[PDB]
């Protein structure tokens, strides 16, 4: 028996823990293996170095730092980390593993501290060889150049410099040798890997001829000041061949010394790379235990740690069971370490999710974490979010393709929740039921719009009747022989005034749906104020806003439905304009051009003065009741709430024209796409027409899947999200609270933690 906590939050408790010192380390593991206690910080106003359990943090994150150095050393000399797949002897059923006890942690500390300096000297030994591999190899490149590199009028310097500095060399040596330079360079094609830095460093050779002795020291200092490695090469061919024979059997000796010096290091890294992840998990868990014990009061007269924590009420029977199992594992006698405390703090929120209400909860929590026991806004979002999507996405076939794309993700849930994906397929997979509901509601909406691939259906008999005879080219009209049962009539398809009906149709649809959404979301404020015993908020905020916005904007909706209900041609009365009379209700009161219902000259004035008198009745009762029980802050905040609640009636009900907007534009772009590509290939008799309609259907399907489902679905999806974040949750959603996020044990994912440090 657990409460559901999807309409409101879950009921909380504050529990004070009386933990003895000798079982404190052990008890925090049991408190962490059940992930349902959020600890509050009792050691506030105490500096981070003055707290207890700080050397037990310094030792453990020194071990963390040495593991980070190890894993940085694993990426060089490419060895895959083992990643022991059994993340189930710590997780899973049972909820009980024995923690490693003391000597295992000391073994981890001294093992890592012994292993670090060993790896440091083994890495430093094999990098003194690479820095003398490099100069010998580039000197071997210098020794094979022929004569054309060494013949232009010791009388020269020779070196290898990076390619970025050759122009700087020749600029300086032209300004220094005054114009008598014989600079010459040939490129080294492969990059030359650096050890002191990590740049790959495209290099090349050079040679500079001159005569004298103060000139060669001059050119030599200028050259090696720009980080050039200079050498000595004989002028004759035979001396160059003797030097090339001398560098070989020295460089091959370095090849033999490099092996079995960079081999024992690598075998040590093969030993470390297996069973490093388990070390890392154990040390991270041990560090988290002391981070939780850091925020508890320490007593000196007796060795008792005092800790507080938030918890939902249905787990006070779980605490006593798990802690009783712990005190039955080790033989002691402690006096009742659990005590439920009576408090005045603010508890966490904690809505329960169960795999269908989870994605919509993650939607609504992206805006703000709700107040404690406030009405959750993720419960109506489940159906009001894909439907407001569907009004903008009113197509049969596009919602059908969206359902197929959703069922490709829903029908294999078990295969996908065990993979590593990255940031796009994540948003695809965690919202698969959102996409399923969006596709099904878009099927229903596109059925009611009579639109499949921008074509009609003809599944019932029409309500319009064409004339009996006409010449080919006569503009005729239809004669209204009844009404059409479900959807728009298919006699509006070509008809050359289809937009003239459809626009005034769907605009009124959008205004009516937006008003019903706003006046449904506004009653959650009444259900809040009735629950928190806040009877001044009802009489001060609910009734003024209800009367003010109903008497202006619900009267418009009643007039829209009433204008639909009345036959104006049979009665012989002129049909009025609802937009005109809405403007003239405020900008010229009392005067009516076309009459809608008999006594409306007085109802306009009555509703205008009621919406007027709701302006001083708001901004007055809620402050002046606080006065007789003004302050300034309540008064100015209530003036801001009045000037913000009003002028959002007009703005928010104007903002629901987007439901009309995106629907009209989706229909028009899909119609132009149908008449632009595949409509061309219908009058093309021959063998060329077969390939023509093949290629043009391929182009049409690629466009209607790329630009018309994926790129207009994301837009209307975040439009249905704006209509809930701004227009809907500004009427009941109070705002700030603190999220639940209990202390629990998790897998840690090493390479994220290395990027988190560096």
């Amino acid at each position: 028996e657990k409460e559901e906590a999807i309409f409101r939050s879950a009921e909380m408790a504050l529990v004070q823990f009386y933990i003895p010192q000798e079982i404190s380390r052990d008890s925090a593991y049991t408190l962490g293996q059940l992930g349902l206690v959020q600890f509050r910080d009792l050691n506030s106003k105490v500096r981070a170095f003055q707290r207890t359990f700080v050397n037990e943090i310094r030792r453990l994150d020194n071990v963390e730092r040495q593991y980070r150095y190890f894993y940085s050393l694993l990426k060089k000399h490419d060895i895959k980390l083992y990643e022991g797949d059994t993340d189930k002897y710590l997780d899973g059923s049972g909820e009980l593993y024995v923690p490693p006890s003391g000597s295992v942690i000391d073994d981890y500390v001294r093992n890592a501290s012994y292993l670090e300096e060993r790896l440091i000297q083994m890495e430093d030994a094999t990098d003194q060889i690479e820095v003398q591999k490099n100069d010998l190899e580039q000197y071997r490149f210098i020794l094979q150049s022929g004569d054309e590199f060494f013949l232009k009028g010791v009388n020269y310097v020779t070196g290898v410099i990076a390619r970025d500095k050759v122009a700087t060399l020749e600029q300086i040596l032209w300004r220094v040798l005054r114009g008598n330079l014989f600079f010459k360079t040939v490129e080294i094609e492969q990059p030359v890997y650096d050890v002191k830095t990590r740049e790959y460093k495209h290099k090349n050779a050079f040679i500079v001829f001159s005569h004298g002795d103060l000139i060669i020291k001059r050119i030599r200092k200028i050259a090696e000041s720009l980080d050039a490695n200079l050498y000595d090469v004989d002028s004759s061919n035979e001396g160059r061949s003797q030097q090339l024979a001398k560098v070989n059997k020295n460089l091959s000796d370095l090849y033999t010394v490099l092996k079995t010096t960079s081999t024992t290091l690598e075998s040590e890294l093969y030993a470390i790379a297996k069973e490093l992840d388990s070390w890392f998990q154990d040390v991270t868990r041990e560090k988290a235990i002391f981070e939780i014990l850091n925020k508890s009061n320490y007593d000196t007269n007796r060795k008792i740690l005092i800790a507080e924590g938030w918890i939902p009420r249905d787990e006070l029977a779980t605490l006593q069971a798990r802690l009783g199992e712990m005190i039955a594992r080790l033989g002691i006698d402690v006096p009742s370490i659990i005590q439920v405390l009576d408090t005045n703090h603010t508890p966490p929120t904690f809505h329960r999710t169960n795999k269908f209400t989870a994605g919509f909860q993650s939607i609504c929590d992206c805006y703000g974490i709700a107040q404690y026991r406030e009405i959750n806004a993720g419960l109506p979002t489940i159906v009001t979010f894909p439907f407001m999507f569907a009004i903008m996405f009113g197509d049969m076939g596009h919602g059908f393709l969206m359902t197929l794309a959703a069922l490709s993700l829903v029908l294999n849930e078990k295969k996908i929740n065990k993979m590593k994906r990255g940031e796009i397929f994540d948003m695809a997979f965690t919202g698969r039921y959102i996409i399923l509901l969006m596709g099904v509601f878009s099927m229903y909406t596109g059925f009611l719009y009579n639109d499949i691939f921008s074509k009609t259906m003809t599944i019932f008999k029409s309500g319009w009747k064409w004339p009996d005879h006409w010449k080919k080219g006569e503009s005729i009209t239809a004669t209204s022989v009844g009404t059409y049962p479900i959807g728009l009539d298919w006699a509006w398809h070509g008809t050359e005034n289809a937009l003239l009906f459809s626009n005034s149709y769907k605009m009124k649809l959008s205004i009516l749906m937006g008003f019903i959404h706003m006046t449904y979301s506004y009653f959650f404020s009444l259900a809040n104020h009735l629950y928190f015993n806040s009877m001044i908020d009802i009489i001060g905020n609910f009734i003024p806003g209800l009367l003010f916005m109903q008497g202006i904007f619900g009267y418009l909706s009643v007039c829209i439905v009433y204008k639909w209900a009345v036959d104006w041609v049979k009665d012989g009365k002129p049909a009025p304009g609802l937009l005109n009379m809405l403007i003239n209700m405020f900008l010229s009161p009392g005067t009516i051009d076309d009459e809608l219902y008999p006594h409306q000259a007085k109802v306009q004035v009555f509703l205008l003065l009621m919406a007027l008198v709701c302006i001083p009745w708001l901004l007055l009762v809620k402050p002046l009741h606080f006065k007789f029980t003004d302050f300034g802050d309540i008064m100015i905040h209530q003036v801001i709430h009045t000037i913000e609640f009003c002028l959002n009636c007009v703005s928010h009900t104007a903002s629901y024209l987007r439901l009309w907007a995106l629907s009209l534009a989706h229909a028009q772009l899909s119609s132009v796409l149908w008449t632009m590509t595949i409509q061309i290939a219908f009058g093309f008799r021959g063998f060329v027409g077969v390939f023509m309609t093949v290629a043009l259907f391929a182009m049409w399907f690629a466009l209607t899947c790329a630009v018309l489902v994926l790129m207009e679905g994301t837009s209307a999806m975040l439009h249905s999200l704006r209509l809930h974040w701004v227009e809907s949750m500004s009427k009941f959603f109070v705002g700030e609270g603190l999220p639940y996020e209990p202390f629990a044990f998790e897998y840690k994912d090493m390479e994220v933690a290395v990027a988190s440090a560096s």
Binding site: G368, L647, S651, A654, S655, V726
Partner: protein, 199 residues
């Protein structure tokens, strides 16, 4: 140098010499600005009004949107909790284009077809003038309101990224600056209040 000032000075000199020459002949009333207003089609003035209305409203909206969006993106690097909070500063710049939409929908119901007889009547010329000036009134007011609300939104995003307690005190200034587009909306509805259709 300064080619635009050279163009402006050249146009000024040519206009002064031309008007002074039309005096010089004794035919100063041939520059007849009033007869140009009679003999010009009223549908031109009406459609320039509607098109320039929706265009200037959208330009002011886009201006405010990127001013507050650049600063909110820049300020959200260290404090990424400002985005869902200061979404409302982009709401306030987006409602400007919706006001332009409402004006275009109201004005486009008056574009009927007139007869060749009584084409340039009193009511038709009145309707063209009213729709033109009402459209550019609400469009320029929407432009200016979008610019101002965008500037205040950028400054509010920076101040809320400082600490959380400041955006309630700076959002009040956006509430002040967002009423000006509604003033332009009301007076644009009132200027074309008594204008009939084209008949």
């Amino acid at each position: 140098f300064s080619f635009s000032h050279f163009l402006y000075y050249l146009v000024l000199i040519v206009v002064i010499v031309y008007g002074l020459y039309k005096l010089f002949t004794g035919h100063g009333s041939d520059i007849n600005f009033g007869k140009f207003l009679l003999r010009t089609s009223p549908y031109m003035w009406a459609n320039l009004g509607i098109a320039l209305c929706v265009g200037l409203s959208v330009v002011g909206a886009a201006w405010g949107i990127f001013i507050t969006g650049s600063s909110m993106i820049g300020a959200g690097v260290r404090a990424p909790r400002i985005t869902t909070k200061n979404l409302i500063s982009i709401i306030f710049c987006e409602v400007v284009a919706i006001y332009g939409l409402i004006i275009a929908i109201v004005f486009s119901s008056k574009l009927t077809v007139a007869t060749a007889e009584n084409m340039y009547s009193k009511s038709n010329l009145y309707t063209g003038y009213s729709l033109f000036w009402a459209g550019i009134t609400v469009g320029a007011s929407n432009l200016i309101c979008g610019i101002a609300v965008g500037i205040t939104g950028a400054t509010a995003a920076i101040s809320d990224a400082a600490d959380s307690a400041l955006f309630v005190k700076i959002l009040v200034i956006e509430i002040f600056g967002s009423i000006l587009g509604l003033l332009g909306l009301i007076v644009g509805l009132l200027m074309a209040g008594k204008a009939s259709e084209f008949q």
